[PDB]
Scaffold this active site. Structure first.
Site, PDB file in Angstrom:
ATOM      1  N   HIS A   6     -18.659 -11.471  -1.342  1.00  0.00           N
ATOM      2  CA  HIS A   6     -18.921  -9.743  -1.068  1.00  0.00           C
ATOM      3  C   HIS A   6     -20.080  -9.603  -1.936  1.00  0.00           C
ATOM      4  O   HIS A   6     -20.082  -9.894  -3.272  1.00  0.00           O
ATOM      5  CB  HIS A   6     -17.629  -9.213  -1.781  1.00  0.00           C
ATOM      6  CG  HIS A   6     -16.502  -9.423  -0.646  1.00  0.00           C
ATOM      7  ND1 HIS A   6     -16.210  -9.066   0.690  1.00  0.00           N
ATOM      8  CD2 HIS A   6     -15.322 -10.323  -0.991  1.00  0.00           C
ATOM      9  CE1 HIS A   6     -15.064  -9.431   1.009  1.00  0.00           C
ATOM     10  NE2 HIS A   6     -14.322 -10.163  -0.081  1.00  0.00           N
ATOM     11  N   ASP A  43       7.016   6.476   6.818  1.00  0.00           N
ATOM     12  CA  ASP A  43       5.995   6.125   7.733  1.00  0.00           C
ATOM     13  C   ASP A  43       6.359   6.512   8.969  1.00  0.00           C
ATOM     14  O   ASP A  43       7.455   6.180   9.565  1.00  0.00           O
ATOM     15  CB  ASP A  43       5.572   4.742   7.491  1.00  0.00           C
ATOM     16  CG  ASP A  43       6.551   3.595   7.685  1.00  0.00           C
ATOM     17  OD1 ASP A  43       7.789   3.825   7.735  1.00  0.00           O
ATOM     18  OD2 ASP A  43       6.178   2.550   7.776  1.00  0.00           O
TER      19      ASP A  43
END
EC number: 3.1.-.-
Lengths: 1359, 88
Positions: free
Chosen positions: A834, A10
């Site tokens: 949701h 990363d």
RNA sequence: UAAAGAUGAGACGCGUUUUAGAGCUAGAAAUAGCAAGUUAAAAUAAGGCUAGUCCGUUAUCAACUUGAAAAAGUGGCACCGAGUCGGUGCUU
């Protein structure tokens, strides 16, 4: 016996974490050889680590220093040209005049000639300085008088006019058109009404010269000018532009409704970058406005310097400066009389003390004018008789020096006018002035063009000029030696950028006509409309696009929506009322250059002939590149027959600036293979689903991704990392990632990995600034509605951090699924759901969430909710839709039951959202690493891909850490950079093996895209050639996927490939493996050792001072005579074993010291270091033992205590705390006691975790204390923080934990920092003694930390 | 060792305006500049600075009509000293 | 949801340092009182060598070996552990 591996990476701006996993997801471990002279020969190390490095900066300050240096060179050359004209008759007038001007810097004892520069005795110097107190008395006398003057005084006037010559902003001569105040004001209101045609500022009778050029104060001139305007605000945009022109500090906040302050002031030296920061916000069509304010500003300042009419003298500036001189004299005499007569005790601190801001601090003391005014204004208010001096002080016309900062607004035609008048007065007496007159005037007016550059001869990396002849370029043979066509062609070939998508193609100018048709069709292709009788709101058809752009974008300058609804819909297509979606109340694009050129030529048929494209494109290119009048004349010769002379001369004066980012071949040159259309043909007329530009490049149905992909090939690696688009910090991140992967391949027996997983996370959460748009969004949203929620409950951008409260205001205080209101007091008892569940995609955004009173109000559907709330709250969602609070996507997701459940196209959309790494910097990174690993060619000239390269999202790995309790605390240690890279390699490889038909969408390379609708099952327990019914791609790690209605579907404990049966994930083992690797004590953290470069010290010039710690800014100069550098910067340190002389006994006492080498001395040291050190007092120096020690060189003491060398006399912490992972989950869960983002059941279980494990705090204090007593070794601060912890053992846990996270700044790596517990601020414990390091062990490390060379420094110095 | 107190920019300015060969020898034997804090510049560096400046002054008087009867004397002295250095 | 992005060329005005712009009277001196002040010349990273009306604060850089330098080379593997990495066979 495993041989297949992977690599996770990363990349960051100050870190590259890395890992190596094998096929069972285990970080391996190897015994590495250790070189050096110590008795240790090998150590086991893990293949996980992180590189740390400081940020790179830009070449901007280096640029500014460079250009200032070359300006001083060129100014000095101007003075030498002039002296070489004068030297042959000056050599008869005075033999040593140029010598005396040449040595005036020296002390009286050092000069060869006499100490008076101009005349040479003191009687004539006192006479000269009595007749001419300033230079403007001399200049005015030489302009006016007819007597033969001295040749020295003529040289002094001409040299003062040539050295300080003025700006080159006005072209040609000075006329009423470009230098009177009233015509620049008329240009400001014409440019203003050009920007604002709805509000024409009437300036029919405003005498702007007599109002803005009166001897008044700035606020009084402002209010008089605004009062002369019919009905305008003083604090409007126009009043801010007039007050900007006068020289005040206007605030541009209330004009554009910005969230922050915008204080612009023209004399402030940050007007360039502050102006660019405002033009980054409010648009980029306001540069002509903020430029037409600056031209008026210098017109006002120039007409306020020259306070003297002409037809009295030929020199306005000189007589004006003598007027200023005499005003200073009479106000000073008046002030001395008024202070002696009234306030006798303040005469010493006004007129004698120079450290204050009186007149002694103004003249002798270095204060500015403004500091003097703030000082003496209350002194003048007290006294009696100070009316007129306060009238002058309010007007910035009290006691003025002549060389003020306001002299940056004098053009060079003033100095040229006085220059020419002196040379015409004084040429009947000196004939060489008459012969050389045009040559002296050439020395003043000559100016090197932008398109020629440095006049190099093959030795600079900045220059491109080619020589027509081989002579020296002077101002009198510039247009004979310089090949201006070839230099201008090199200029175009150098200053024109290349296209990122399709390289070796040049980007169009931003004011190009094709870039403007592109941006207008790119905006008109995604605007929708709904009509009564057109209930499916479609896009615009392509013939409607051609008629809208041929009726509105070719009539008005800017097009707002009211002309689209009025002139086209209500008149041409003749509807009654049509709502228009996709465009917000005004278009952002415009056909601006079409209207500029249309104003110049006034011929519609020439612009619309469309076979005259390359002529106009070459015109806009010519006016974009060049600013020179003569080269613009030279290049538009070929088009002169297509125009008259007035339109041609008016085309020359129109300069454009700006380069776009898309080439001409990318807009009209490459074609789709199936249809035979360019990108502009898709944007004019596409068909059913009008796809815009990004939906054309990133579509696999079309050939565009294939062409742009195959064309991006690009040489060396530093060209790859030089050509791409990004800050220099992230480019340093990319280059270190390439070197890390090279050495990780060298470690693993030179076998290339199966995969390279890459993830480029960000650090850009800086603010709160999004919460201003939250507050403002509820402001405009409710003010659209008319409800009673803002009145009873006022909003602010500090309370809206709660998302239940932000959703409370967004739903107008109303429950979604039930027709009821909502209490604001009981957000603890309300549910968030949701709409499209978490088992389909991970969507925590505000677009998906709905606040409800009971979570089971949505029915019993495991899919999207029912249609009762659709049909009942349809108009409620209409009111929330038209308030710009809920979007059409949210309403569509609420009405997926109205369109009959979900489809496989929906689920392919969800995978489409989850997989695709849409950013371009990561795509260039995977292009570099893929073109660097995969090199081999097969027989058919295809590319064998040995190494797959994978780019993931950040939210995949982030949600992996959140959902499986691999929590991250960035403040404990630096191991999180390594652990994020390991989890990239775990997640990406488990996905690459689980769904092998989704490899086209996150592996770099040309792969066969498969039918994503066919890889989706239709029944639940169906699962054969399918992948999933649940479209969340990260479900197979979980044992229990959770439906929204309240069920648990339990997945198998061993996930395999659905086709080939390879075991890819075992939940009973691999979580134990991952949790076992995120708690290893040894992780290869490396800080990169960097040699310091930059400036030689703090770069201010100081006065003379007798301290011997000041190295002078020159060489023979004694620093007690002039002054010097305050603290020089060290490049690197050097360990020296040599014998110095101990004292008066002249003994050869051997020492072992640490000597810093400075940035000034660095090249002298690297030339011959033995001579360098030996001239600094080191006899008997051995060459083999000079050890370069850059910054962050790592040393090892006893008990595993490490130290990084910060400078030649200071150290830093070099150790890390491998805190056990149970304490890290305890600190994350404890200090995040409220912000948990989960259900209250399992977060109540987490409350039981911290409450049942509260003694972990005491065990952490034992960890920090034992690590601190071993390696940190600051005893006073450790007892201070143990007492500070004992004073608070009854406080709540969510601040004890939140302050133990502050306690880890004692035990970090790097510079010691002052922190703050509950009460105690602890000062930093510096390691100011490098004495212990000379017995330590020096560790040289490669970029991965694995190959290292350890040097025993105690075995150096013995014989 | 008896030489004045200037630097390299001031060295170049102060040896420009000589009017004979003997004046350039005197004003050359009176000035230096240190190239770093303890070492003095070499004579070939100082003569190359004087070559640059009497090249400029020697050549710009030819772009004009000005009679440079000197400044080609001093430049030939400078170039002969530089030749005597660089041959050895 | 994706998309300037850095890099380069030309030119002003201040600022800051030295130095020039006769300091006077009272007093053996310290010191006191008074006068005056606005401008100019030069330098503006130290310096460099190819000597240009150029270059001198960016990017690049562990150690050792071969190289003038752009560069190319140098470091066994597997199991059981883990307080910054240890132990155990295996070819050497």
């Amino acid at each position: 016996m495993d041989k297949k591996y992977s690599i996770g990476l990363d990349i960051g701006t100050n870190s590259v974490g890395w890992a190596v996993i094998t096929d069972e997801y285990k970080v391996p471990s190897k015994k590495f050889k250790v070189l050096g002279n110590t008795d240790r020969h090998s150590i086991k190390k893990n293949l996980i680590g992180a590189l740390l490095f400081d940020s790179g900066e830009t070449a901007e300050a280096t640029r500014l220093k460079r250009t200032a240096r070359r300006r001083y060179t060129r100014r000095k050359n101007r003075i030498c040209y002039l002296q070489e004209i004068f030297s042959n008759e000056m050599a008869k007038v005075d033999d040593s005049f140029f010598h005396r001007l040449e040595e005036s810097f020296l002390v009286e004892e050092d000069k060869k000639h006499e100490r008076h520069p101009i005349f040479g005795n003191i009687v004539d110097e006192v006479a000269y300085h009595e007749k001419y107190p300033t230079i403007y008395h001399l200049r005015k006398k030489l302009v006016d008088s007819t007597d033969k003057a001295d040749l020295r005084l003529i040289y002094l006037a001409l040299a003062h006019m040539i050295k300080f010559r003025g700006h080159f902003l006005i072209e040609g001569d000075l006329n009423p058109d470009n230098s009177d105040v009233d015509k620049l004001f008329i240009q400001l209101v014409q440019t203003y009404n050009q920007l604002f045609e709805e509000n024409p500022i009437n300036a029919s009778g405003v005498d702007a010269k007599a109002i803005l050029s009166a001897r008044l104060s700035k606020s009084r001139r402002l209010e008089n000018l605004i009062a002369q305007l019919p009905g305008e605000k003083k604090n409007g945009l126009f009043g801010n532009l007039i007050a900007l022109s006068l020289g005040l500090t206007p605030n541009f906040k209330s004009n554009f409704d910005l969230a922050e302050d915008a204080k612009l002031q023209l004399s402030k030296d940050t007007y360039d970058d502050d102006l660019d920061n405002l033009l980054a916000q409010i648009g980029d069509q306001y540069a002509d406005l903020f430029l037409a304010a600056k031209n008026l500003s210098d017109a006002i300042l120039l007409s306020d310097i020259l306070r003297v009419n002409t037809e009295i003298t030929k020199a306005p500036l000189s007589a004006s400066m003598i007027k200023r001189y005499d005003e200073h004299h009479q106000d000073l005499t008046l002030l001395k009389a008024l202070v002696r007569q009234q306030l006798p005790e303040k005469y010493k601190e006004i007129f004698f003390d120079q450290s204050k801001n009186g007149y002694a601090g103004y003249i002798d003391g270095g204060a500015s004018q403004e500091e003097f005014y703030k000082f003496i204004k209350p002194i003048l208010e007290k006294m009696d008789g100070t009316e007129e001096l306060l009238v002058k002080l309010n007007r910035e016309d009290l006691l003025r020096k002549q060389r003020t900062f306001d002299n940056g607004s004098i053009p060079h035609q003033i100095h040229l006018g006085e220059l020419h008048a002196i040379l015409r007065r004084q040429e009947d007496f000196y004939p060489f002035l008459k012969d050389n007159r045009e040559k002296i005037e050439k020395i003043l007016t000559f100016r090197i063009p932008y398109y020629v550059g440095p006049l190099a001869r093959g030795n600079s990396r900045f220059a491109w000029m080619t020589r027509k002849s081989e002579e020296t370029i002077t101002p009198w043979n510039f247009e004979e030696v310089v090949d201006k066509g070839a230099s201008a062609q090199s200029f175009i070939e150098r200053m024109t950028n290349f296209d990122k998508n399709l390289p070796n193609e040049k980007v169009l100018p931003k004011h190009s006509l094709l870039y403007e048709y592109f941006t207008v069709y790119n905006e008109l292709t995604k605007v929708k409309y709904v009509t009564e009788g057109m209930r499916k709101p479609a896009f615009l058809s392509g013939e409607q696009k051609k008629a809208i752009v041929d009726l509105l974008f070719k009539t008005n300058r800017k097009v707002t929506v009211k002309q689209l609804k009025e002139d086209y819909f209500k008149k041409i297509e003749c509807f009654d009322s049509v709502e228009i979606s996709g465009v917000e109340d005004r278009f952002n694009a415009s056909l601006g250059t079409y209207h500029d050129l249309l104003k110049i030529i006034k011929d519609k048929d020439f612009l619309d002939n469309e076979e005259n494209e390359d002529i106009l494109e070459d015109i806009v290119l010519t006016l974009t590149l060049f600013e020179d009048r003569e080269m613009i004349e030279e290049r538009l010769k070929t088009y002169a027959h297509l125009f008259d002379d007035k339109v041609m001369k008016q085309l020359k004066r129109r300069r454009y600036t700006g380069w776009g980012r898309l080439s001409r071949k990318l807009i009209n040159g490459i074609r789709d293979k199936q249809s035979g259309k360019t990108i502009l043909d898709f944007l004019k007329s596409d068909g059913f689903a009008n796809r815009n530009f990004m939906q054309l490049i990133h579509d696999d149905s079309l050939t565009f991704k294939e062409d742009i992909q195959k064309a991006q090939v690009s040489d060396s690696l530093h060209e790859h990392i030089a050509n791409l688009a990004g800050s220099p910090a992230i480019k340093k991140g990319i280059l270190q990632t390439v070197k890390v992967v090279d050495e990780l391949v060298k470690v693993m027996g030179r076998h290339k990995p199966e995969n390279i997983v890459i993830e480029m996370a960000r650090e850009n959460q800086t603010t709160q600034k999004n919460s201003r748009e939250r507050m403002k969004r509820i402001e405009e949203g409710i003010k659209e509605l008319g409800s009673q929620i803002l009145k009873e409950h006022p909003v602010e951008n500090t309370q809206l951090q709660n998302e239940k409260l932000y959703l409370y205001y967004l739903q107008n205080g109303r429950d979604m699924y039930v027709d009821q209101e909502l209490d604001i007091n009981r957000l603890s008892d309300y549910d968030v759901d949701h709409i499209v569940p978490q088992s389909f995609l991970k969507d925590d955004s505000i677009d998906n969430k709905v606040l409800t009173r009971s979570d089971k109000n949505r029915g019993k559907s495991d899919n999207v909710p029912s249609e009762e709330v659709v049909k009942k709250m349809k108009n409620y969602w209409r009111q929330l839709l038209n308030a710009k609070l809920i979007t059409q996507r949210k309403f569509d997701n609420l009405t997926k039951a109205e369109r009959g459940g979900l489809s496989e196209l929906d689920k392919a959309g969800f995978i489409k959202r989850q997989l695709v790494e849409t950013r371009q910097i990561t795509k260039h990174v995977a292009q570099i690493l893929d073109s660097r690993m995969n090199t081999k060619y097969d027989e058919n000239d295809k590319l064998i891909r040995e190494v797959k390269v994978i780019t993931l999202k950040s939210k995949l790995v982030s949600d992996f850490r959140k959902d499986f309790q691999f929590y991250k605390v960035r403040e404990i240690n630096n191991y999180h950079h390594a652990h994020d890279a390991y989890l990239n390699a775990v997640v990406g490889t488990a996905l690459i093996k689980k769904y092998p038909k989704l490899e086209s969408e996150f592996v770099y390379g040309d792969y066969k895209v498969y039918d994503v609708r066919k890889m989706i099952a239709k029944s639940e327990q169906e699962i054969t050639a399918k992948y999933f019914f649940y479209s969340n791609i990260m479900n197979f790690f979980k044992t229990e996927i959770t439906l929204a209605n309240g069920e648990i579907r339990k997945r198998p404990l061993i996930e395999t490939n659905g086709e080939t049966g390879e075991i890819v994930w075992d939940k009973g083992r691999d979580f134990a493996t991952v949790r076992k690797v995120l708690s290893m004590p040894q992780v290869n953290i490396v800080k990169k050792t960097e040699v310091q470069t930059g400036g030689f010290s703090k770069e201010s010039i100081l006065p003379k001072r007798n301290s011997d710690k000041l190295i002078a800014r020159k060489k023979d100069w004694d620093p007690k005579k002039y002054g010097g550098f305050d603290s020089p910067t060290v490049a690197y340190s050097v360990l020296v074993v040599a014998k110095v002389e101990k004292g008066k006994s002249k003994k050869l006492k051997s020492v072992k010291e640490l000597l810093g080498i400075t940035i000034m001395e660095r090249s002298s040291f690297e030339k011959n270091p033995i001579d360098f050190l030996e001239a600094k007092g080191y006899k008997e120096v051995k060459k083999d033992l000079i050890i370069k020690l850059p910054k962050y060189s790592l040393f090892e003491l006893e008990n595993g205590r490490k130290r990084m060398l910060a400078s030649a006399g200071e150290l830093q912490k070099g150790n890390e705390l491998a805190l056990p992972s149970k304490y890290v989950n305890f600190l994350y869960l404890a200090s995040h006691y409220e912000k948990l983002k989960g259900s209250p059941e399992d977060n109540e279980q987490k409350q039981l975790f911290v409450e049942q494990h509260k003694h972990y705090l005491d065990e952490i204090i034992e960890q920090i204390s034992e690590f601190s007593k071993r390696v940190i070794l600051a005893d006073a601060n450790l007892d201070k923080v143990l007492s500070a912890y004992n004073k608070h053992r009854d406080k709540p846990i969510r601040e004890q934990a939140e302050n133990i996270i502050h306690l880890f700044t004692l035990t970090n790596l790097g510079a010691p920092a002052a922190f703050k517990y509950f009460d105690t601020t602890i000062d930093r414990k510096r390691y100011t003694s490098t004495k212990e390091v000379l017995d330590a062990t020096l560790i040289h490390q490669s970029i991965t930390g694995l190959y290292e060379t350890r040097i025993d420094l105690s075995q150096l110095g013995g014989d | 060792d008896g030489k004045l107190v200037v630097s390299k920019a001031h060295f170049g300015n102060m040896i420009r305006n000589c009017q004979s060969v003997e004046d350039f020898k005197k004003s050359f034997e009176r000035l230096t500049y240190y190239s770093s804090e303890n070492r003095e510049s070499t004579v070939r560096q100082r003569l190359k600075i004087a070559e640059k400046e009497y090249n400029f002054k020697a050549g710009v008087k030819e772009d004009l009509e000005i009679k440079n009867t000197t400044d080609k004397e001093i430049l030939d002295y400078v170039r002969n000293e530089l030749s005597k250095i660089d041959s050895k």
